[PDB]
């Protein structure tokens, strides 16, 4: 029973939920690998065990298990896998699993929100054109003219027969990355691979630094098909600074809706290789990581030149001053556009509250400190001083191999 201290307050907690940890993580008594981004590498009896555990949680979570629907659902499933080799979730068990998989996501700082989630059941989907319809309705619903609402759309589960639904893009909205004569990139360097695939599947390239890529949606067995997103569907925010008037002339933009489209959803031994989810941004994701990472847009020095900072020496802290101003610009620009955004201070303070609630509810909360602490001003946020236990519970979102 790990003991966990908050060094800002002195308070002590024990994580009894960790005792119930399932699939093994990457660490051993020999060596800790908690900093690695992708740990490890990416008889229908196992199904029944996983299926049984998920039902018990469910009927506990709706307050009373035992006999009743519990014992009947139990063998409806047991008989369905005997008949089918797989089984079907009820609409409500699907809702519960999606919400739990989010609640169990250790690297998610936004989990105070885990109860408010819109689940869109897309398991009756057959065509990639239907995939595109579900996606565009999700995008419409989630964006809500800038008043962002969490949502997930669940496409058909992986069948032992043949097919898998896949969204090839890592997110629903992504800016292209064009390689040039140099070997450098115009646009987003993280997307040079997916931009190439969209090209070689028909898409006609674009001019500049913020071209929204098309969607490459893959229905079972048939290969992926290009789809362009209607531009009035992709809400974007031009970036301006409240007091540096030249900032807007840098022509920076970002999109409103962060929507992950390439992670696998796992619920009671069932696997949904296509279950896009979306929430809203914490401002340091845009301002610090996406615009300032050396291997992303890498604009920090551009901004520092414009601010007349002394870039000749590291001890002027010009990287830090410029970064704070870029984050200011992101927060200002999103507020101006009335698009939902949260700063890292408000987000981390809410995650603290979430830890407190989860301690009473389940006796702990898997949390991955390296991902919860913001990439700027870490120790100025309260999570920096919070010890955390990281472990894997089910249902869960997981990374999967890319379909190429």
Ligand X SMILES: C[C@H](O)[C@H](O)[C@H]1CNc2nc(N)[nH]c(=O)c2N1
Decide if 280 is catalytic.
yes
Q: Which does 385 bind (CB under 5 to 8 A by kind): ligand HEM, ligand X, ligand F2J, none?
A: ligand X
Pairing of strands 263-267, 396-399: antiparallel
**Peptide bond preceding 395 in cis form (omega within 30 of 0):** yes
* DSSP one-letter code for 66: S
- For ligand X, which residue has the nearest CB? 371
Give the angle 135-138-143 at the CA atoms, nearest 5°: 125
Q: 103, 108, 158, 240: which one is catalytic?
A: 108
Beta bridge partners of 217: 167, 225
Q: 93, 266, 285, 358: which one is catalytic?
A: 285
Q: Which of residues 296-315 bind its own copies (CB under 8 A)?
A: 300, 314-315
Q: Which does 280 bind (CB under 5 to 8 A by kind): its own copies, ligand X, ligand HEM, none?
A: ligand HEM
Decide if 111 is catalytic.
yes
Nearest approach in angstroms of CB 179 to ligand HEM is 23
In the three-class reduction of DSSP (H, G, I as helix; E, B as strand; rest coil), residue 11 is classed as coil
Between 325 and 368, name the residue whose CB sits nearer to Zn ion.
Answer: 368
- The CA distance from 328 to 135, in Å, is 32
Q: Which does 371 bind (CB under 5 to 8 A by kind): ligand F2J, its own copies, ligand X, none?
A: ligand X
Which helix (H) or strand (E) covers residue 84, if one does? helix 68-84
Q: Which of residues 229-268 bind ligand F2J (CB under 6 A)?
A: 258-260
Sequence positions preceding breaks in the chain, C–N over 2.5 Å: 42
Please name the residues in contact with 359: beta carbons below 8 A apart, sequence gap of 6 or more: 13, 365
- Residues present in the chain in total: 404
Between 281 and 391, name the residue whose CB sits nearer to Zn ion.
Answer: 391
Pairing of strands 281-282, 341-342: parallel
CA-based torsion, 179, 216, 171, 393: positive or negative? negative
> Which among 23-31, 86-94, 128-136, 391-399 is the span making contact with Zn ion, rule CB under 5 A?
23-31
Residues that bind its own copies (CB under 8 A): 2, 4-5, 7-10, 15, 18-19, 21, 24-37, 283, 288-289, 292-295, 300, 314-317, 319-321, 323-324, 327-328, 331, 335, 343, 345-346, 349, 368-370, 373-380, 382, 384-385, 387-391
Q: List, as residue ranges, the binding site.
A: 27, 32, 35, 108, 171, 280-281, 285, 289-290, 370-371, 384, 399
Residues that bind Gd ion (CB under 5 A): 243
């Amino acid at each position: 029973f790990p003991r966990v201290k908050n060094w800002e307050v002195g308070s002590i907690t024990y994580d009894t939920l960790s005792a119930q940890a399932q699939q093994d993580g990457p660490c051993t008594p020999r060596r800790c690998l908690g900093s690695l981004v992708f740990p490890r590498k990416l008889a229908p009896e196992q199904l029944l065990s996983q299926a049984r555990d998920f039902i018990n949680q469910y009927y506990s979570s709706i307050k009373r298990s035992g006999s009743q629907a519990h014992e009947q659902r139990l063998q409806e499933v047991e008989a369905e896998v005997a008949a089918t080799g797989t089984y079907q979730l009820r609409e409500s068990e699907l809702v519960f699993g999606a919400k739990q998989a989010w609640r169990n996501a250790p690297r998610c700082v936004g989990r105070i929100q885990w109860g408010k989630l819109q689940v869109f059941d897309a398991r009756d989907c057959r065509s990639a054109q239907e995939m595109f319809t579900y996606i565009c309705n999700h995008i419409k619903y989630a964006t809500n003219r800038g008043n962002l609402r969490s949502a997930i759309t669940v496409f058909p589960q992986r069948c032992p027969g043949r097919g898998d639904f896949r969204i090839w893009n890592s997110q629903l909205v992504r800016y292209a990355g064009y390689r040039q004569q140099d070997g450098s990139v115009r646009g987003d360097p993280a997307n040079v691979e997916i931009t190439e695939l969209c090209i070689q599947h028909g898409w006609t390239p674009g001019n500049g630094r913020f071209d929204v890529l098309p969607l490459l949606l893959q229905a079972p067995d048939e290969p992926p098909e290009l789809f362009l997103l209607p531009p009035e569907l992709v809400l974007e925010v031009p970036l301006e600074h409240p007091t540096l008037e030249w900032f807007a002339a840098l022509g920076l933009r970002w999109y409103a809706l962060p929507a992950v489209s390439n992670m696998l959803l796992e619920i009671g031994g069932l696997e949904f290789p296509a279950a896009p989810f979306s929430g809203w941004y914490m401002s340091t994701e845009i301002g610090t990581r996406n615009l300032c990472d050396p291997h992303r847009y890498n604009i920090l020095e551009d901004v520092a030149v414009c601010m007349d900072l002394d870039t000749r020496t590291t001890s002027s802290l010009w990287k830090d001053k410029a970064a704070v101003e870029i984050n200011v610009a992101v927060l200002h620009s999103y507020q101006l556009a009335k698009v939902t955004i949260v700063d890292h201070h408000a987000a981390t303070a809410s995650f603290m509250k979430h830890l407190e609630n989860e301690q009473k509810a389940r006796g702990g909360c898997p949390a991955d400190w390296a991902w919860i602490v913001p990439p700027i001003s870490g120790s100025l946020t309260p999570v920096f001083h919070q010890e955390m236990v990281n472990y894997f519970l089910s249902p869960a979102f997981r990374y999967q191999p890319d379909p190429w």
